[PDB]
């Protein structure tokens, strides 16, 4: 239903810091992978 | 050894080569078959190094071309003096230089353009000129239009003499290669007669003509009541009661009692409070000292009488331990390659133009020059852009010399060979320092913009939040303000008012006042340093990699001016040195645009303005300390706060500026597709148009082709630079005339 | 590597080989031209695609053709 | 009164614009003595402005809500409301001059392609031939339609260079 | 003379002559007929 | 040629100081090219990787990171002094491959020994449309 | 002014259409490049030969028409 | 090939030799520990100098120290990413895969230690 008041205080940090970091780490492993 | 070597009548003065357009080169000697030939005819027209391999004929052509350019310059100067003589209000301006605007161009009433003849004052209508010719003529003692007419006639006569000299020294009496190669004689004659004797002649004119007329003008008497300069020249009574040391009559000069000449050869630094310009006696002693110094310097090189230095010996003797063969082959390089001399001349002339712009915005060496803000701004910007173009052409012709005239046999372990041998380290370090400067200046600007938009005025790099004050510049300003106090005790005041002191104002307008340097000044100065560094990087990468590289090892065989080496190695477009100069032209444009924007904002906010009883009220109210730290401040408080006069100039005499402004924007846009796109698209469009004209049997015999890739790049950069320069010219002139 | 294709319109003028900066082309004996020469590309793995051979071709259209694709260390002209 | 536009003679804003221009011209004129060249130039400018404002009137011109004259475009509407000379006749004159230029250039191209090295004649003009063709193009449409009739105006597609498909 | 005449027969010289003639014709027309906009007599 | 010459690393290098456009890390990881020639006299030439060097009277050996640099030096020596040089390619494992004079008579000549490869026996413009070769991996110019 | 800006819009539409159909109709061949079908849709150029051949593909015509479409909109 | 007095000075060679990166024989975890200690100690400074809460007494030091520790964590993550990307395939053990992984672990340990040392040094 209605998200809590700390939801903007929590969800934006993941998708702004650690979700791009995890995606960039996975993609960087994907580019340089050999067979 | 040094003697005149002249061949008699090598080229016949005939019109048979005027009928055939393409005659200097064998490629164009066969006639035209495509339209690019025409462009080639207008491209290799003055590329004398490609027409013939003989250095003597190239040197003769260079001599005659220089004579032609001098004749063109003298024609232009005579036209300026003629326009001041007839279509001008110079005599009216001499009575009240602080209320009548200088005007020397009058238009014809044809289609409503007579509104451009604005009310400049003095019962005259015309275009307000910003060249400062009025102040130059006032500094030269010119009073009536008869003197301007005589100067115009003499300039036309000298231009005809220069054109006759070019024709004669090409067709009739052409100097040989040994005549041109006497670099010691050329340097001695240029230092002693071209510069020293010219400085002495101008000092004599200032002493005997310009100083008394300027003194009487500053005294407030009528210009018609002022005696003619020949009255000062012949009868010694007027110059004696105007200057008592003239009563001695050349005695103190020969008796070494030069201190008696202290009345009309002064050292009073600063500006004359009557007119807001440099003291004429100071300029007279300056040009006298310059003449003596250059006369001394002109007797340095040995030509025909044993004594004197040798350029080759001097160059070969200066050899350090870390440089191998010290300056060994440079004497043979600069006596055989015209392009190396052209590069050196263009670099020094462009730098000299930059010094000229700086040192006549700082000290206005003309009466009533600082009061005319528009004249000072136009002169600064013009000399700035001429210097930038010349220093770009310096790198261009250095790259041309590297491609064409470089010989590896004469350059094995000399300075040029070692520079080529570590060009990669040079370019890499220059690239690194360019990146570091761009980051720590433009990122500072972006940081200020963000923290301003984020509501953090305390987090900015401003004069109130984080003071990055220019401590070195402030210390130098304080030292030069105290230069007459301890280190130059014979100077009456400071050499300029920019360091500090009181405020000199003329006619209620600020002539010169002290300039304060803050955080915004440090930011823009480091921005200018970054832009100059990047332009140096581009031009040096063009010069050093003109011959070969790891990407392209045979770039020297491709010539200086080639478009590409195909899409190979991933693509090799814009790899030539010419393309490097073409790229660096835009960077020079951006650099000098930021420089002149900083100049205009700084003098409009902290220098120029009016003087009231309360204090000095500037044009923009001194917002540069608070608005120049952000890009949005430059957008709003400099580009949007100004340029309102340009867009509202319609219906007034300034409207053409706005018209030019709009047209300039047009030209700046019209370049872009020459800068973008390519050649195959336009070639196919031209093929379709050729089909259309072939259907109606109106296809031209000369096959139309698209412009070359190098030609397209040149057209794009030329139209881009023209649009940008005209935009800045129109905006600057309209803003500085409407409110200045 | 790039693909270099040579057709029968070649006249054996050896201009494409002289313009080649990496020694990709060669001349082989032939009977389809007056000069009895035909261009060949036995070292097409060393070609970078500079199209200098196409510039030197005197025949209308092109008797030699370079097609880019599948860039390698040698095809990209890299010294590193 | 077409397109909701009042005539310039009966308009209101047209008179306001005329008075404003005369007022700023008189304000510029009052700054000079009557016996001066700028005074004569400004008086000539004022006379030219008055003559232009009078000649724009009594000619069928229409202006809407700003006093700036508007040009009636559609022929027939312009023909029946005395507006043919606004754009209908100027395009006829322009078509005449443009066809003159095109026919003269076509004649020069055709006559210059006959001789050896026509590119030399293209880049070095035959001035007597150019002036002769300049004074022979007064009947360009008759000649153009007659070459269209005999087929010499058009070239067959078999003889025209065609890009590959 | 004929070399000079062929020099004037070149394209830029005749282009300059045409431009001067056309500009002078249009300027004299606009001067002797001040501000023409409406084709009326 | 009649017998393919073998690369001799003990041949002296030309008189030259330090180099900056010379061998990078690709030389010790991938192949690098080596140009040898036989100078009849002492003369000064220009390297494609930098400034100027002086070749010794006798065998001369130079190293480059690209084959284009080797052929640029080869054509400079052939046009300037008619030197007829030759360059090898050395891999990371030490395999030496003979590159420029494959039949020893230079590719400008014919020698009646080479076999013409990668040649299309049709005229250009007679190739099939890209619709004809679709989802097959074969280009119109490769058939 | 509305009529003038509408005619300018018509100019933008016609010019963008001209660029796009020049790219599309000359996509598979042209006088400068007869074998443009063999080089695919997106290739850089053919080199400096035949006077210069940069921006000859239909992709480059599209990329110029993007500028013209941006100006029109 | 172009040797210089800058790149061939004995003093420069000795200064480069005793660094943890170019040490003769030292286990890679010790090199990582020294690297992390030095680089975290220098990185803590600019974060406590002109951080977002520089004007707040007490909060500036802790905010800058946790910012430096977080940056050290991102640097360790990127170091491990480089180790996994470059040394996935097959005589210096630091350039090996597990050697570079031990170097990254030593780097994050040393970075945290250096951040803590900077905290306890700026607190006194
Ligand atoms: C949408 C993504 C996103 C998010 C959520 C943030 C969030 C933040 N950034 Mg920003 N930033 C971003 C993208 C983002 N950034 C991008 C894309 C750029 C480049 C253009 C920047 C450039 C930037 C700069 C230049 C600065 C910030 C700063 C900040 C902080 C604002 C001030 C503050 O709250 O101090 C809170 C401060 C704390 C110490 C609270 C704890 C939060 C820390 C910083 C994260 C944890 C540290 C790390 C994991 C190591 C810790 C290890 C251990 C102690 C657990 C905040 C944490 C400022 C900052 O952090 O100061 C150093 C700062 O100066 N950011
Ligand atoms: C002291 C003697 C003297 C003087 C004053 C000059 C002056 C000049 N020389 Mg020259 N030169 C000299 C000796 C001298 N030369 C000698 C001895 C040599 C041979 C070694 C040369 C070789 C030389 C070359 C190769 C070139 C010059 C050029 C120039 C011009 C440079 C442009 C400039 O500053 O504009 C200043 C312009 C003016 C002041 C306008 C007036 C110019 C007047 C007409 C010239 C009067 C000086 C003249 C030398 C008097 C003798 C000539 C006499 C036979 C009639 C300038 C006019 C350049 C050139 O061709 O420019 C045309 C050039 O490329 N000089
Ligand atoms: C190039 C610069 C220049 C020139 C042209 C002059 C010229 C003059 N100054 Mg000045 N002066 C100068 C620089 C100059 N000065 C400088 C740098 C200073 C230092 C501050 C001074 C300080 C100064 C003072 C303090 C005074 C002058 C005075 C004079 C006059 C005296 C002339 C004289 O004795 O000289 C020597 C001149 C000659 C020997 C004449 C030259 C020889 C002639 C031309 C030979 C002609 C022969 C011919 C072939 C045959 C006839 C031809 C015919 C048949 C057609 C004269 C007008 C004095 C003055 O105004 O009183 C009158 C004066 O009181 N000057
Ligand atoms: C204003 C337009 C503009 C800008 C900003 C750039 C930017 C750049 N060009 Mg270019 N240039 C341009 C137009 C422009 N170009 C044009 C039109 C031409 C054609 C003539 C050239 C010709 C040209 C040449 C010939 C050269 C350059 C070079 C450069 C670099 C400048 C060196 C530097 O310090 O950059 C620093 C970077 C910037 C100024 C970009 C803005 C950076 C901001 C502040 C962001 C900071 C980081 C940010 C917070 C991180 C984002 C995080 C995010 C990923 C989440 C940079 C990449 C030079 C080069 O390669 O490097 C020396 C070079 O040699 N350019
Ligand atoms: C940003 C640089 C800069 C600039 C433009 C100036 C400019 C000026 N200063 Mg300042 N100065 C500076 C930095 C600068 N200064 C730093 C210091 C601290 C050491 C000083 C200390 C200082 C003092 C103490 C004084 C000045 C004064 C002056 C004035 C005259 C100086 C003079 O005669 O120069 C020489 C003028 C020339 C025209 C010479 C130019 C020669 C050209 C460029 C060629 C040079 C080639 C060179 C000889 C070859 C290199 C040789 C090398 C290899 C050994 C002038 C306004 C004086 C003053 O108050 O003004 C009246 C004064 O008393 N300055
Ligand atoms: C194709 C462009 C075009 C357009 C959109 C118009 C539009 C118009 N014309 Mg026009 N017309 C045109 C070309 C055009 N004309 C041409 C080329 C001619 C030949 C010279 C005419 C001759 C013409 C006449 C004779 C009349 C119109 C009239 C009209 C109006 C009404 C037409 C209708 O069917 O009712 C309308 C404004 C009529 C009008 O005035 O409307 C009241 C009218 O009587 N037109
Ligand atoms: C101040 C007045 C002025 C000016 C300066 C121009 C300027 C121009 N006009 Mg415009 N025009 C004007 C008024 C003006 N026009 C007026 C009042 C009308 C009538 C409403 C037109 C109608 C008009 C048309 C229809 C065309 C132009 C074209 C042109 C351009 C090239 C002319 C040319 O190729 O040279 C002179 C001409 C030649 C060298 C070749 C002759 C070609 C002409 C156009 C054919 C004439 C005969 C033809 C069979 C009649 C039917 C035309 C057809 C469209 C139906 C040029 C920018 C042409 C253009 O831009 O093409 C891209 C074009 O097609 N104009
Ligand atoms: C007099 C010669 C001549 C003639 C008869 C034509 C005729 C034509 N051209 Mg061409 N054109 C010419 C010269 C000529 N053109 C020149 C010199 C250029 C280079 C600027 C072009 C560039 C050009 C383009 C880019 C296009 C045409 C198009 C067209 C067609 C549209 C009609 C028109 O006015 O277009 C407008 C034509 C112009 C605006 C060009 C005017 C150029 C100058 C001003 C006129 C030159 C006159 C010449 C010097 C007279 C010589 C007389 C002699 C005695 C010296 C038509 C088939 C269009 C087309 O394909 O339609 C199907 C098209 O897209 N032309
Ligand atoms: C075919 C074109 C036929 C036009 C017939 C016009 C009849 C009315 C007429 O002559 O009166 C006006 C007198 O203009 C004149 O100065 C005479 C123009 C003569 C037009 C026919 C040639 C012309 O119409 P206007 O000058 O009032 O039109 C507005 C400007 N375009
Ligand atoms: C537009 C364009 C063309 C096409 C333009 C060409 C071929 C040049 C056209 C020049 C014209 C002929 C100049 C003269 C124009 C007028 C006819 C002259 C003025 C006429 C009035 C005075 C009446 C290129 O060839 C090209 C090549 C390489 C990069 C970019 C481009 C590029 O952008
Ligand atoms: S350049 Fe062309 S015609 Fe000449 S040998 Fe090569 S493929 Fe044949
Ligand atoms: S594109 Fe260049 S490297 Fe390739 S075969 Fe042609 S000329 Fe040789
Ligand atoms: S033809 Fe044009 S796009 Fe192609 S390599 Fe040359 S400059 Fe670049």
Author numbering:
A (entry chain I): 74 to 108
B (entry chain A): 12 to 751
C (entry chain C): 2 to 81
D (entry chain F): 63 to 227
E (entry chain J): 1 to 41
F (entry chain D): 51 to 193
G (entry chain B): 516 to 588
H (entry chain L): 56 to 145, 160 to 193
Paper text:
Multisubunit Photosystem I (PSI) encompasses half of this Fe in its three Fe4S4 centers and is a target for degradation in insufficient Fe conditions, which reduces the capacity for CO2 fixation. TIDI1 (thylakoid iron deficiency induced) is an iron starvation induced chlorophyll-binding protein found in multiple green algae including Dunaliella spp. isolated from coastal Arctic waters and hypersaline ponds. In this work, we report high-resolution cryoelectron microscopy (cryo-EM) structures of PSI-LHCI supercomplexes from Fe-starved compared to Fe-replete cells of both D. salina and D. tertiolecta.
We used single-particle cryo-EM to determine the structures of both D. salina (Ds) and D. tertiolecta (Dt) PSI-LHCI supercomplexes from Fe-replete cultures as exemplars of the native state (hereafter named PSI-LHCI1) at overall resolutions of 2.9 Å and 2.1 Å, respectively. Three subcomplex features are evident in the structures: the PSI core, consisting of all but one of the 12 PSA subunits encoded in the genome (PsaA to PSAL1); one crescent-shaped LHCI tetramer made up of four LHCA subunits (LHCA1, LHCA8, LHCA7, and LHCA3) arranged from the PSAG1 (proximal) to the PSAK1 (distal) side; and one LHCI dimer (LHCA2 and LHCA9) on the opposite side, together accounting for all 6 LHCA proteins encoded in the genome. For D. tertiolecta, we identified 167 Chl a, 1 Chl a’, 13 Chl b, 42 Car, 3 Fe4S4, 2 phylloquinones, and 42 lipid molecules. The poor resolution of the D. tertiolecta PSAH1 and PSAL1 subunits precludes identification of associated pigments, Chl a201, and a carotenoid of PSAH1 as well as Chl a302, Chl a305, and a carotenoid of PSAL1. Although D. tertiolecta and D. salina are separated by ~253 million years of evolution and inhabit distinct ecological niches, coastal Arctic vs. hypersaline desert, the PSI-LHCI supercomplexes from the Fe-replete condition are highly similar, underscoring the high conservation of PSI subunit organization and antenna arrangement in the Dunaliella radiation. For both D. tertiolecta and D. salina, the arrangement of the PSI core and the inner LHCI tetramer subunits in the PSI–LHCI2 supercomplexes is almost identical to that in the PSI-LHCI1 supercomplexes.
